[PDB]
């Protein structure tokens, strides 16, 4: 199926709250954590703890201490560029995806106060800037050709190799399938209106397709889609509703299901 690896950084100036937090994920699973309070990088998944020796955690604890310091300075510089005082946020997201079809994606992005600031394009080796402050930064970063090449290599080769390594460590969790339990609920709501709800729960992975069809064909009417939500036990739940021959169609991990009303 599709899998992803991503590392986030969050920097907060003058916090109420850690000044710096970094979290890693594989798919929807936290794998690693570091903050300016613990000053230690730690596993967040037991399959990460069991497969990476103490030297991995010791080395990355040092790297994260260094990155924490640089993040603080970069945020001070951004505030000075914007003439901003008080508390502001700086975020980074790096990562890659290995798609089921075999294709790969790689991404590296920054945000200031929760909005896109700089987006790296690894195919053109350039940074897309949202405003004149981001442009000043883009010019400074793009002057270092070796760093752009290094980032392209990391996204395309290193990130994918780390992802495949973690996917194997966490295979019993990440590569399992828990099929959905699906039901259809019918209810007369406002007088003369009938609502049909197709509800699914207990599934893993969270990715699920749900739709309503009329006489074996795609509807013209509006379907309301429930969010895919964590149930708290490692599984997920979702729904789709319509108002009014109707049938609910569910696709999950290569299996199709139809519930005719």
């Amino acid at each position, epitope marked *: 199926r599709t899998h992803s690896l991503r590392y986030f950084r969050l920097g907060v100036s003058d916090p109420i709250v850690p000044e710096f937090i970094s979290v890693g994920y594989v798919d929807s699973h936290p794998i690693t954590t570091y903050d300016s309070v613990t000053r230690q990088k730690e596993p967040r998944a037991p399959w990460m703890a069991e497969n990476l020796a103490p030297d991995h955690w010791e080395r990355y604890t*040092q790297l994260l201490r260094g990155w924490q310091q640089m993040f603080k300075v970069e945020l001070k510089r951004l505030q000075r560029h914007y003439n901003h005082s008080g508390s502001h946020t700086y975020q980074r997201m790096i990562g890659c995806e290995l798609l089921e079809d075999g294709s790969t994606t790689g991404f590296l992005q920054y945000a200031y106060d929760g909005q896109d600031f700089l987006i790296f394009n690894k195919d053109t080796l350039s940074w897309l800037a949202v405003d004149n402050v981001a442009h000043t930064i883009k010019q400074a970063w793009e002057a270092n050709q070796h760093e752009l090449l290094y980032q392209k290599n990391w996204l395309e080769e290193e990130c994918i190799a780390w992802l495949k390594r973690f996917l194997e460590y966490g295979k019993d969790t990440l590569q399992r399938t828990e099929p959905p339990l699906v039901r259809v609920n019918r209810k007369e709501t406002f007088p003369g209106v009938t609502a049909l709800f197709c509800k699914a729960h207990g599934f893993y992975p969270p990715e699920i397709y749900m739709t309503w069809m009329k006489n074996g064909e795609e509807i013209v009417q509006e379907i309301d889609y429930g969010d895919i939500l964590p149930s708290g036990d490692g599984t997920y739940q979702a729904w789709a509703s319509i108002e009014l021959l109707y049938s609910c169609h569910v696709e999950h991990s290569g299996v199709h299901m139809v519930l005719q009303v």
Partner: antibody
Amino acid sequence: QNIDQPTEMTATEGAIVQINCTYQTSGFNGLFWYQQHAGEAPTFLSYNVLDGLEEKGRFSSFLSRSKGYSYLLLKELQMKDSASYLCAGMDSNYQLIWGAGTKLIIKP
Amino acid sequence: GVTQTPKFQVLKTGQSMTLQCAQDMNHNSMYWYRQDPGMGLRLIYYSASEGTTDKGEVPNGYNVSRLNKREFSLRLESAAPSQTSVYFCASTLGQEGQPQHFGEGSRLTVLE
């Protein structure tokens, strides 16, 4: 993890020399060359991370990622090129693995 | 650049020694290496940024202090003949492959 480069090479003044370096690293984040004259500090010469040849004056540095191979090419050799050339690979954890160096001797 | 001292030092076995290293390039990372014939540079200790240090490949018989952003000192608490070597301090802007800038080197000879 291992970096392999010849112990010593000898070439003639005015000619060309290619110093090979093979790396067997746990992941790859770049390949560096440094120059170190006798009794002096090493100084940065080059960095390669993607495939290709990068030219800087009389010196060129090549990388083949699929072969895990690099070379440092020195053209129009001068007596001042007599030095040790250090190859260093960066692994997945951004740590350098330093080669034992190639001592380059130039014949006048 | 990187300023390291002393250039030369003779020590008797058991004596203490501190090597000094400073850089005014606003670099975050600093390193102490030993260079011996027939082998690649070996990292003793490093400092990823001000406020942190960690062991390299050969930390036994040494300790370090990242005094401030500029300074990274190397100490030999009880000099041993095996510590006869050429020591190099280096610094880099960051931790991800920015070029290393080296000090002049310190030639230490430990004698009984």
